[PDB]
Amino acid sequence: SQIVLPPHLERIREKLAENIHELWVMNKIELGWQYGPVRDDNKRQHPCLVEFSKLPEQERNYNLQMSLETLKTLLALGCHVGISDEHAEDKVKKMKLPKNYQLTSGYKPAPMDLSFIKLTPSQEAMVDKLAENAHNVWARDRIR
């Protein structure tokens, strides 16, 4: 609770939300998970294959907020944000991913910059602690 969202971090909050929405849309459309624009709870139709606006905006705000406590947990563990420059902020490359691994709309698949960045073992340990805390939060929500 004590963590307050900074403007620098909320600038990329919505980009992270769009990226994770990309994760759900492509993962569903690739694993063959059922497509439905309508919220039909009976035959298991999932609206996670829809454009941002026509996506259930309650779910989209859920994703935006989930990003928020992701940022807040990451800052609270002991990782401090540092902005390099607006040039590296602009630096991003769009992969060429076809319609099969693309969502139904024409939003070009562009998750992430696979070119030069590598994964640190310390970053992996941090993300492990992040998943630990997220699972703990979800379990406490279920207990409530």
Question: What does this protein structure show overall?
Answer:
It is globular and about 45 Å long. It is built from four helices and no strands. With 144 residues, it is mainly alpha-helical. The PDB classes it as membrane protein. The entry lists the keywords calcium channel, membrane protein.
Summarize the structure.
It is classed as membrane protein. The chain is an all-alpha fold. It contains 4 helices and no strands.
Q: Which terms would index this structure?
A:
1 chains, 144 residues, mainly alpha, 4 helices, 51% helix, globular, Ryanodine receptor 2
The number of helical elements comes to 4
> Which bin fits the share of residues in helices?
40-55%
Total number of β-strand segments? 0
Main sheet specs = none
Radius of gyration: 17 Å
Please give the alpha-carbon distance between the first and last residues.
18 Å
User: Which structural class matches the secondary elements?
Assistant: mainly alpha
PDB class: membrane protein
Keywords: calcium channel, membrane protein
Entry title: Structure of PKA phosphorylated human RyR2 in the closed state in the presence of Calmodulin
Name: Ryanodine receptor 2
